[PDB]
């Protein structure tokens, strides 16, 4: 019940002497579905306590590594020292189709490679020569973005002027993003700045152009980052219904799709946290309605497909019914094969924003009860959405400390834990099966009916692996 | 459509006909893709010599670098001391990236904390971040030493780490006796190896500067070993094993092998092994200090010679035959202990393997890259094997190191077609292997993309990659390997000769076309 | 035509145009070669299941076997004793073939002699042949012992080794106290492992049968270890290392480590190391004898139990995790010494590696072959990894081994699709891998052709080979590897995971076609 959960929370917090305990008590809570506003029990979107080994990232990670990186035909310059591009290079599986180095540059690392002279005297002229060199060596690029790492915002470099001058000179769009790491407390502000850059530099280049033929079935997938091909599966599912997916970004995204987005009739937002800003802006300016959708699990997929078909004519509704009837036997077979091997298992998740609350439907579709979820950068609305779907008497955490996660797992003792790479081996050494909830553990997709089979197979292969039974030596 | 019996992951599920039709529609309808003939023309242009001339005229753009920033090496150095917590003064995204990098290489948990400095600390400094973070890190993780490195935010503002730590001790956030050494690791100067050097110098300074009055050189009959930035656990293990075989006392400083290879037995061990504080304090009493990678341990060498008054030997990295022989002979001269029969037998076995594989290793052309000391050791070993290193790339190398490597190449007739490039990146090496094709590349995982590019020009133009170096992300447990000493040379020789033979078998597998050379015995 | 700058060997010198025209003219003029379409349809027919049904009905024809004859194992056993000479009573062609086989595998000198019996010796016997041969061998090569095996020629004619040796001693050709053990090794019975067993039983009989009056079990506080037919020096190394870490006194009978691993230091050594005769005469005094490969050490077990009176434990081969644990626990029980923390930590490291690699290892299908004990150990280790053995082939297996492996498969859930074949050759395995395609194959170099076969059907039907076993001819220095113990399990795990990842990288190297799954991090 709640008494033991609160006792465990207090016991874990006892380590923090005076102030860290007060800060961390606010981010730990116990679920209650009757609560609408999560601000009464949990507090998020706050600065992290120093020296606690947080798992959050920076604004540069949320801008370059999340929103702008997946755009294939654009060249993204990590303005600053070599480190951040190096570490952010190809470490995220935002899949795409293109020839790398010619018309695709997702896995490439472009940087200004700041030195001491650049720090002391600035790097605006270096950025100008950067842009000319990029244009001469990569002529098929369709635009350049300039993601600012820490030193650039610190030394007061003004890259908007050089970006505008170069855009005028070479007649190519150049998007300056001030995504310095010190800004904000996590990757969420990186999403906000990247969204503002898209709004102010890309979204309105065809506001006076009407050469695009439009159909009443025009939709745009917003916030689908094609992590292992989730966007492709969702897109095939939506096109089997008869809807034209005109735009798809950032995952497998081109600048042309972003430019054509204002012409669609609906905005299907997958990740609310990372693109709600542009969703509301497109509702306000162009009058395009948007909805949240969930393709993670057959039940949630069916519900989302029916909801999307609700606001089109009868043809679209009947095509949605036909798609559901077509894909029903496949996920029924997946459930039949994999439910007996997973019924009753307990899961705890700590991933990020949208995913920790959206995986719940397919986790339950296989019969596995979820007893704890948490975020690192989500806002209060994310928790408000989480309360309804999450079950009662479950532990919720924000900005988890590695110590906190360690001693929470040592008490709850679940059968499976889904988190990032920085906890994979920590939890592996404890005998608890682990799944990389972002990397999908170098597998996927997990979205759509096709992704449900892979998700079930991966859950089975990790949860019932023999290696988890051999951690204790027979003589010990 | 997914069949329940044979579930397909992304490959080759996206090879299905419906998916191809959907991607084709997406590309043709709204992507505004350039025509494919233009793509082919631009690719062929990028593989040309004129593109190489344009690429080598780069002065402001770096594409696909082969180096990292200082705090990563500082964290790796700090991980090598007992119950030590790496503490980065600056942003938290840096620590997230360092942890991700080291997890993806070692497949292990890596412990590092940050003080989480924000925009406020950019106007008023990071003093309170230091105090609160040091207190919290001491409270919840209970280390015996907190080793403080910096992030570029902290270097641009100009935070005084010494004053910050001293004030934190004075107020009462940490006990005055608690070891908190520090080092300045600017990311715009040098690379991760420089960060390792700075961290080691800082730790040595903190533990030895104000206690040199009672120190006598050689009073404890031990040899200090400083390994530098090392990501192969086999290297630490082999150094310890060969120094124990000779029966010489050693004190390996900054040994992280235990925390990087913790056993999985149902519990998480955040700390394991490492160099003790007593060892670090007793270091000035040793006979001498030997640096395995002197080309990025310059400031450590300066501090050891100036303060500890140790006549540091001029030794190259113990890679290959000759340099391992020089290392062993110098250790024998310093300690007075003769080289035993086991080491001689192991050297003879390496020579035997060389005699066995020389007919396959001769004349092979290699493009290799990595860290300065590792690259120079590999070049030396390749010269001993009769191979021809053609493209030697070191992004973080300097003019003096290039001159040393050129002198090494001049000593052998196999360095005639060798050019050493410093300050270049993997795009330069892509151009070099397209224009001056080698037989193989030797480098980290980032080279795999280059291989793909070569395969796009044609099978005959492909340059296979051999994964030796840091980081290796697409293979498992290669970090347990060895590169130093006779054992490391044996492993490198086996890797090289097996790569050559596997490539030869691949090229001659076609039936009735190239199968006449598909020999059972090679 | 050859260019002195770039000289071409057979590949690709026979790919130039003029050679192609010459070959085409010869083919079209003088071979009367079958039309190509006939060849393609015959190959396709060979890949079908009707051809599989015809193939598995074979009763008299053996195509590409997977075994050798007894005297090869006899020579290998004789090479494991100090200054011992493998003498083979029979024809010289047999010794030439044995020497060439072991030279190609180990890449080391292999010393073996024969009496070179001719037709007149066939008609009249080999008594004078063995007298002269023993005298010449002792005079020229100066061994301390001569271990005599037989060829099929001598086994058919009923050559009495005992009488011949006793007559040679009586007539003065060799000293009476010179040890000349013998074993009958008929090549038409069993295989090479049977010859190893017979040779070891003969040596043990010669040294212990007549001197068991003053022998007390457990007098010298040691455990005898009988390795059997082993072709990985790392296996002997790991067994000795693990026994020494436990502090257990042991006597590794038939230790061929040194004679197959001599250094290249300027001199040639015919003999090196080896089990000493004093160790053999003191063998009955040991606590107990442990057989590492019990499935071919049957006669040795009978002799040890019936004469030495040692209650030999029922242990499988110490391969994989569980069987290594059982071996260590049994050795601890016999010797009374606890398992040290080093081996517990090594087991933890192995379990950590399995935990890291389970994602890429789960569900993969393997077709493997080799010796009985080694094959069953691979089956067990693969089952522990979650892998699925589908085709298990042992040409030199029997019904009892089939039952044991069937029980092992039935214990695990990863053996529901596993079939075990005994008495089948590699042509049967070719049919199986064509009709029920596994992900990979695990065997010796002879499997490479099978891989070639699969590649001729298509890139999607190719079955890559992983080289574990005996003999390995087309790769260098793989006999250095380890398969036994935790170190062997780590090596096998690394090889399998990296093979899977390399295959995936090859499948995803197509630009714009399959490079979406060409991930840097795996
Ligand atoms: S963008 Fe966000 S951490 Fe919404 S920064 Fe992060 S590809 Fe996570 S839970 Mo990595 S808010 Fe996407 C995410 Fe979720 S990189 Fe991916 S998995 S749905
Ligand atoms: S919070 Fe984020 S990742 Fe950190 S620096 Fe800032 S944008 Fe970048 Fe960069 S080079 Fe290295 S990793 Fe830093 S110390 Fe600077
Ligand atoms: S001299 Fe020549 S190679 Fe020798 S047997 Fe005679 S034909 Fe043959 Fe054959 S199976 Fe083995 S290798 Fe012999 S013992 Fe018989
Ligand atoms: Fe690990
Ligand atoms: Fe050899």
TrEMBL record, chains B, C:
Every Nitrogenase molybdenum-iron protein beta chain N-terminal domain range: 1-55
Enzyme Commission code: 1.18.6.1
Organism of provenance: Azotobacter vinelandii (strain DJ / ATCC BAA-1303)
Residues that bind Fe(3+): 108, 352, 356
Cofactor (UniProt): [8Fe-7S] cluster
Alphabetized PANTHER family for the sequence: LIGHT-INDEPENDENT PROTOCHLOROPHYLLIDE REDUCTASE SUBUNIT B
SUPFAM superfamilies reported for this sequence: Helical backbone' metal receptor (SSF53807)
Gene from which this protein is expressed: nifK
Name used for this protein in its record: Nitrogenase molybdenum-iron protein beta chain
Quaternary structure note: Tetramer of two alpha and two beta chains. Forms complex with the iron protein (nitrogenase component 2).
Classification via CDD domains: Nitrogenase_MoFe_beta
Keyword ATP-binding: yes
Cofactor note: Binds 1 [8Fe-7S] cluster per heterodimer.
